[PDB]
């Protein structure tokens, strides 16, 4: 989950 969310955030920003 940690990495999944890191990447999600990267995209969102």
CA distance 10 to 12: 6
Angle (CA) 9 10 13, round 5°? 80
Resolution of the experimentally solved model in angstroms: 0.9
Angle (CA) 2 13 10, round 5°? 30
Question: Cα 11 from chain centroid?
Answer: 7
- How is residue 8 annotated by DSSP? H
Question: Cα 9 from chain centroid?
Answer: 4
């Amino acid at each position: 989950a940690a990495a999944a969310l890191a990447a999600a955030l990267a995209q969102a920003l």
